[PDB]
């Protein structure tokens, strides 16, 4: 049989798409977005009806036009989490707005306000993840939210710094991502072939779940963003992988037994102080690939919500 | 007559050098230094004495290892200062430990230190600017040591928001860098020349000296990091402007009279609410050439201050 089977035998899958499409098809226990693709989402005409419902919900909540913009993206957002949850029996990850990255206040209340719109839906946050930007800021917010009862996916993580934080701060789940550090290292070094055991996002999930796992963390450790199935089969193995609809199909028709690669073995070890602020910021610093992506991803989804905000606004 | 002496008419020459010999041959007002001149000064025969002055000053102070490396290169990097304020009326500049550029607290700590050794040295707070990395971190030291009678150079100055920040803070002068502008630009676009009016190392210097000058702010701009003539002709006007002696023999070699380029003629404008933390974080990382910069100038910093501690230890 097929590689998609024997990788779900050691590696919790879960689908990077808002499209219910992929849902139907592949089964997915979990399903991931965010605002890039929310954006892509809404282009899909059989989902129509969500945007309509979205602004019209948000023209009941206010005759504010600025309010009615946010109320409707947020709503929007919402409701294709509400769909895929008809079709997948574990969490849905809605993002918080990006532009909220660096203030630890406002992503707190947005965070509430997107949980508020699903509870009063009907759902409860045990199926539910949001996530934000593995910034201090986003962390501290999700040290904060996971202590009210909301389960938090930390993204955009890229540094060991950015690793450890979050293990420290007890969140519920971290994005570490595999193929945008793949971008960088082609980007900015003569090596662009990479076997897939020296493929720097695989080397990086790697010793991040080895780091967890060594310590007794609880946090789940997804992989996230992937450029080939060759990144995806050598982290076979990690708690969760959430993998774009393209590469699903790739693995399902690709015949043959894949092995584990991703355990851990040994003692519990004991854990040190935990990092401070200063100390996060240096060691996050040291790092150029991890400097450049946090911030670029950022600027990215919150460009994607803006355009969001744009197609919303023409249509109140 | 020449370009250095038509550069003069509009500007206060800084030399940019831990030589002695430069100051001699184009007594400039201030000098700037940094660890990276520090290291290349530490180099150079005649300063062997200042090297070993620093030794046994460090031995002086404690039987202790590590403490007599952190002393002896801080009494080297000072007696260097001292040889140079010898030579030149104005101030020097000298730059704290870069691994120390995201924490506040060891920064105050470290700048006192400095001042400490000079003043005993004979040399009041007029004659002294510290040096530090224009992070949130170091802005907010710099805020302090302002108040308690230090006067500091933030440096590593790239994006809008570390320039509006260092403003609010009062900071006493900033060093926007012109040359790694230009290096980045040409490193991550295609665009590989530039007029000297479109170098963005100059637009950016432009636009801090307008914004600084229109709302009446009093920190003094000095464009640092050059790699060519044209850059410097083109903010004739600044208020300093810190040049390294390979350009300094360029523009007192050049024939010709310069034009003022860089006035503001108008009304004072009123001033925003200050920058919030959140908001420069949020603005900075809007500014892809800022983010890698600022965190390559630390790292860069960072090391050589290392490699100037691997030389001291050798010599315990």
């Known amino acids: ?37 929310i954006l892509n989402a809404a282009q899909i005409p059989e989902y129509r009806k969500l945007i309509d419902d979205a602004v ?3 023209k009941q909540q206010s005759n504010d036009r600025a309010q009615q913009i946010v109320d409707a993206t947020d709503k929007l957002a919402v409701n294709i989490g509400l769909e895929i949850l008809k079709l997948v029996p574990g969490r849905i990850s809605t993002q918080v707005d990006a532009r909220l990255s660096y203030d630890t206040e406002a992503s707190i209340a947005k965070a509430k306000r997107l949980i508020k719109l699903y509870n009063d839906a009907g759902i409860s946050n045990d199926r539910i993840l949001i996530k934000l930007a593995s910034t201090w800021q986003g962390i501290r917010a999700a040290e904060q939210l996971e202590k009210e009862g909301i389960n938090c996916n930390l993204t955009l993580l890229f540094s060991f710094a950015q690793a450890r934080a979050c293990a420290e701060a007890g969140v519920f ?12 290292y082609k980007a900015n070094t003569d090596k662009k072939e990479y076997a897939p ?22 946090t789940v450790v997804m992989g996230a963003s992937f450029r080939n199935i060759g990144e995806i089969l050598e982290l076979a193995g990690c708690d969760r992988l959430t993998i774009a609809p393209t590469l699903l199909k790739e693995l399902a028709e690709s015949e043959g037994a894949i092995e584990r690669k991703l355990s ?6 004991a854990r040190p102080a935990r990092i401070t602020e200063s100390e996060f910021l240096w060691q996050h610093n040291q790092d150029p690939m991890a400097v450049d992506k946090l911030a670029e991803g950022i600027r990215k989804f919150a460009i994607d919500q803006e355009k969001l905000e744009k197609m919303i606004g023409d249509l109140l």
């Open 1 to 37: 049989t097929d590689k998609l089977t024997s990788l779900r035998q050691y590696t919790t899958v879960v689908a990077d798409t808002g499209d219910i499409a992929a849902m139907k098809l592949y089964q997915p226990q979990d399903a991931t977005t965010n605002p890039s693709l």
């Open 56 to 58: 019209a919900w948000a």
């Open 173 to 184: 789940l971290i994005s570490p991502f595999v193929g945008r550090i793949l971008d960088w």
């Open 197 to 218: 055991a020296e493929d720097p996002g695989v080397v990086s999930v790697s010793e991040i779940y080895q780091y967890y796992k060594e310590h007794g963390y609880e």
């Open 264 to 269: 851990y073995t040994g003692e519990v070890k």
